[PDB]
């Protein structure tokens, strides 16, 4: 089955899906099509774990049951530079206001 | 003459 993902870096979020059997490398190719950096300049993360290019998304822990359309799994993205290190950084979304008294 | 649906006394069962 497919896994449904949010690939996040800074204030960018990509909603995409991929087969559980597809590789991290193939996911980097999807990102390359969108953000125009090649796979050898990308770092993908599940939480704080760097994902190995050769592993499948299933082997990384992304499974259909836990990466669903209505509740996609987050993949962290960082880019490489020629002489600096970019810390993985995902900016949080906004916060809702207080629940109205009539809804409490 | 008119026959309506009815539920036999049996246990329900769990799905999945």
């Amino acid at each position: 089955m497919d896994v449904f993902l949010m690939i996040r870096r800074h204030k960018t979020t990509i909603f995409t899906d991929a087969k559980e059997s597809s590789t991290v490398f193939e996911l980097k190719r999807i990102v390359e099509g969108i953000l125009k950096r090649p796979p050898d300049e990308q770092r993908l993360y599940k939480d704080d774990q760097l994902l190995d290019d050769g592993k499948t998304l299933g082997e990384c822990g992304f499974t259909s049951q836990t990466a669903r359309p209505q509740a996609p799994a987050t993949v962290g993205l960082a880019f490489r530079a020629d002489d600096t290190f970019e810390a993985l950084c995902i900016e949080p979304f906004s916060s809702p206001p207080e629940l109205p008294d009539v809804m409490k | 003459e008119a026959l309506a649906x009815y539920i036999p006394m049996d246990d329900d069962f769990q799905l999945r």
């Binding site: 949010m6 960018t12 979020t13 209505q70 979304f93 | -």
Partner: protein, 88 residues
Amino acid sequence: MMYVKLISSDGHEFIVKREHALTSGTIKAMLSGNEVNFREIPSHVLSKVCMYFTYKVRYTNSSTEIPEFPIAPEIALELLMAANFLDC
């Protein structure tokens, strides 16, 4: 694969498949003739809208068990207004 970029009120950018974005009647009419400004929708709401697009495309015309689309009480009013505005 064509993608479109939706921008929220706080500057978060959401990149979604164009086919999925056409779930919104509002977006469909705009693109029926890409980057789209939705600066009246906050990111916590627009993120949920994009999840809805994915959900709709996956489960429409499906024969499997459809899971509930989850909405937290605290986002419900703003999500309602965004759904009304976006026609989905």
